[PDB]
Amino acid sequence: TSFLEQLYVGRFRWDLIHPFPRQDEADRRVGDEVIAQLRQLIEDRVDPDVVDREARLPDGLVDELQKHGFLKARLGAEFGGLGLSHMNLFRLIEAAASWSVPVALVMAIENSVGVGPMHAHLPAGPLRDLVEARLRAGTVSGTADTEPAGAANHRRFTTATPTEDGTGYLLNGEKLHVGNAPIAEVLIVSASVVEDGVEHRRMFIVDTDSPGLRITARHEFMGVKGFPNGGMVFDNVFVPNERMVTAVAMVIVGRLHMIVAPSLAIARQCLGWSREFVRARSIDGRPLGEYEEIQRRLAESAADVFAIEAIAEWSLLCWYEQSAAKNIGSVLGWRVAERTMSLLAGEGYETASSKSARGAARPFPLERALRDVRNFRISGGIDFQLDYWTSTIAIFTYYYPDPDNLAEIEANQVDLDSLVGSGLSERNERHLRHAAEQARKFSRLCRELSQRYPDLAALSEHERKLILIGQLSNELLAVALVLARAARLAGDGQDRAQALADVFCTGAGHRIADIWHQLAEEETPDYRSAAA
Amino acid sequence: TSFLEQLYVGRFRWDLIHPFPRQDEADRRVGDEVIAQLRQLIEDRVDPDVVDREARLPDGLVDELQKHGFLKARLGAEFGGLGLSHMNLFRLIEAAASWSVPVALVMAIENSVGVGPMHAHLPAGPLRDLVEARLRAGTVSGTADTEPAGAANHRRFTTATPTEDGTGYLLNGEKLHVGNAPIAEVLIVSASVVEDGVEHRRMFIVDTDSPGLRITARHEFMGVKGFPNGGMVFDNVFVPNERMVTAVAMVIVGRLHMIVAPSLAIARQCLGWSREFVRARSIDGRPLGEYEEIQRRLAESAADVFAIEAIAEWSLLCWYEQSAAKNIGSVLGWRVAERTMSLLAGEGYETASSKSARGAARPFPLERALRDVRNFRISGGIDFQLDYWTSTIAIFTYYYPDPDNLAEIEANQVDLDSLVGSGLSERNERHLRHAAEQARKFSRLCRELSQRYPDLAALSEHERKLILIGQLSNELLAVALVLARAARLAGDGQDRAQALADVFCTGAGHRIADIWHQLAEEETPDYRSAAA
Ligand SMILES: Cc1cc2nc3c(=O)[nH]c(=O)nc-3n(C[C@H](O)[C@H](O)[C@H](O)COP(=O)(O)OP(=O)(O)OC[C@H]3O[C@@H](n4cnc5c(N)ncnc54)[C@H](O)[C@@H]3O)c2cc1C
Ligand SMILES: Cc1cc2nc3c(=O)[nH]c(=O)nc-3n(C[C@H](O)[C@H](O)[C@H](O)COP(=O)(O)OP(=O)(O)OC[C@H]3O[C@@H](n4cnc5c(N)ncnc54)[C@H](O)[C@@H]3O)c2cc1C
């Protein structure tokens, strides 16, 4: 069953996550070999600073990645693929992202939500034969969903009308901010088909060379400069019947690769840059690493990385937890980069090329890292919006008919007896007790709100409270997995894991308290008067 | 006396800030005229997007600013200056920053810490005659203090050794990240003179064309692209005796212009961009401005702007409050820009030129605003470092001998009777009661820490606690001034002020609670093990 699903009804399932899993040693060594090959390739052909300054990937890179099976990492030998586990794909994207995020994002889309991953789901027919033929030949793909109207719209205004002769459909509409679009051979397009008065969302496998399809825009953002990203108009684009697809777990697990892997990569580089800077600097004769606040900030960044690692390992060694991984990964990644900017200060704010030009010891592209990491709280959904959707669509669903374990909620039941054998420190066992108590409190809150509003549609109006509840659920999951991983790695002789776990749960402790304080607001201000 | 100084010893001096001052109407109308002239000039000659993309100001701008007295805004008619009040200079920089921050920063340095502002302090002699001659002719200046060693160092390693013939000094050392350096005619340089075994910090008025002075580096950062910023080597630069200066209120009040004015400008543009985006967008048939979370976020940004306005008006209509204005202004400015990025989402992350290229309705340079605003938590000191220095150098100084008002601290004395006549709402009067109680609690905390460590040097080791205390003092000042300004503007018929005040104090309420929770930490984790 599901740890986070149980957490929503106030159960702290230590037994589901302890002992914390670890990657198979043979599988990890297969990862090590493929990662070494990619690093050789991109370090030879890609200068990340030049890619950022020119906002362009070097000519020939996508080809060379294709020839070595890096755009078919999860496919079998049949397709000239590397047949990597999810854990090893994630590590491959992480490895790419630590050099150039644009390169990582191209690889992430293709190996996550492209026609390659989709192949296995398609039924036998012409479409499946075409995708296979393209994959053998080597293809680049993208998902074209977002419209100017907004991604958060339940409807898609891009229409698919059947042709008079019934052979295919005419696509009409606009797609915005589409990853890989400018280099894509084929796009997975979302469009509405009207069937006798009722609108229906359908997916279409559309060639980019289709007449009436126009890549009008090439999008450049604050970060990920060089990442192929395009907007397009469909003007009566003819799409044969077979090209119409005829689950969403592929999209959720895809976020681990597209969002969390690059977030971890950046968080790791930032920790590296923090340590190198602290090692080489001093204030008033005393080396910078001796000042308490500097020590705490290195600890907090190190603990954040450990937490991104925990959520990533739990997600890919094995559902709702993988949904929360998007926000936990992206936010922790952004925090580390923000913290690192404060630490490196003036040098941190300075561009890599500027520092390189003046022969600086540390030409670290931290400012690029901070601009890039911001993407991952936007791309794949806005953090507060995902926090809202998580609590209304996945937390109050268990309470609206009524909670099945309602007796447990009124009784304030907390199983402290199942946390007895851990291997955790006396402090990390205290963190574990408190998280289990907070789990039960979380459910009691959810019950009061559900009792307070009979209609969910009415409850769904109170967005701030539901966002905070989304956040609270993520904090407790992060604490739980961090303690589980700590117990495991400490058990296998990594004693630093206890300290890292201790730092993170202490911090989470303050964020949880803050979230409760905001939830406990009795009277709301007239924010509508203020907004005007 | 000083409101913030009294706040440090737990006194809430409502009587010192109520009624809140307002700018003289005649003075403000003089501001309106000068601001209109600057806007005409820069809107004609400066394209802010081009300045950002090329990281260069257009040729001739500094001249045209000089010819119209914008680099001598606070000087008298004698010098061809505009003789503006501090409040009007701040508004002039704000007006410039709302168009192009680089332009604002050049003007801010010259009108704050340049040779122009310094003129009045200099004693009669050749140096004063030279500065006057330069100011009449039109000059550009900068302060060269920061060295590769770090700005936070008490010592400066740049040396000034007297010449054998005793006519002047030889300057040797390196300065980093110097504003206006590449366009400066003269620089105010910090350097150490050794007098019979004891080091001494001295200021030198050095011409940039001095042989042995080399502008080796031209610094480009994440934001403020185009802002002239240079690093230099001094190789036995000869400086005549008269060129050696022979208080720091000029630097503190300068921060209002260099840090807070551009922070307010960005915060205001961001609120404007938020409202325009919300007005034009809808989700599921419902316009975006009808969703609670959207309403709250517009309210929180509007309330933040109001708070930056409050600290700015209190600082320039009239010391320690002006020190805290740096952090309050910069942080609130950064929060608004961060909040705005989440709101505008994909469009928000996209560059102005990208959105312009594809004929977007809103080619808003939000991403540029976010990159620029980050500067103001670094430039003029790192936010957490200023929070540390504020509590060790300006909060515990009143408690180390002992607190003069110790009786008040033990007695938990809170004057609720002086807050009776305000004009505030019943909610904003509650906010006022709570701030006065938090003021007293703040002093009781400070007493316990002072009692706990007999030696300040020992107390100064505990950096996290002292930073949090710095933060707590700033939050209560912000609440106090917001309520004071609200009472005044509501009294003069602006009823929205009550709502804006209410939004801000509610938010501050949560930040204060969070700060206390972190202060109340009983046992600390082993962060030194984690840092490694
Ligand atoms: C680098 C990058 C790459 C991308 N690549 C792709 C891609 O390959 N394919 C693709 O399809 N898309 C892609 N996107 C689009 C991205 O997923 C969207 O930008 C994002 O999911 C939503 O952005 P939007 O501008 O459409 O926001 P909207 O959905 O319009 O939201 C606008 C604002 O309103 C808020 N809001 C929305 N609904 C509510 C509500 N009910 N209550 C309160 N507030 C609400 C949102 O949180 C947001 O702050 C990419 C984006 C980026 C930045
Ligand atoms: C755009 C820009 C313009 C600038 N213009 C000028 C200018 O015109 N003139 C000028 O002189 N300078 C200028 N500066 C320099 C700027 O003021 C400094 O960068 C800043 O004050 C300190 O930066 P630093 O790199 O020297 O940091 P450092 O002082 O080396 O600090 C390094 C880190 O250590 C931390 N730290 C320091 N002391 C302690 C302590 N005791 N305990 C714990 N942690 C500590 C700091 O908070 C920081 O995080 C400019 C900077 C920028 C970004």
Author numbering:
A (entry chain A), B (entry chain A): 7 to 252, 265 to 336, 346 to 559
Paper quotes:
Epoxomicin is a highly potent natural proteasome inhibitor and the structural scaffold for the anticancer drug carfilzomib. In epoxomicin biosynthesis, this conversion is catalyzed by the flavoenzyme EpxF, which remains to be fully characterized. A high‐resolution crystal structure of EpxF revealed the architecture of the active site and enabled the identification of key catalytic residues.
Consistent with size exclusion chromatography data, EpxF assembles into a homodimer with an interface of approximately 2500 Å2, further stabilized by interactions between the C‐terminal loops of the monomers. The isoalloxazine ring of FAD is planar, consistent with its oxidized quinoid state, and engaged in π‐stacking with Phe227. The C2 carbonyl is positioned in a pocket formed by residues 149–152, while the C4 carbonyl oxygen interacts with the backbone NH of Gly185, and N5 is aligned with the backbone of His183. Beyond these FAD interactions, our crystallographic analysis of EpxF revealed a well‐defined water molecule located 4.1 Å from Ser406, 3.3 Å from the Gly407 backbone amide, and 3.6 Å from the C4a atom of the flavin.
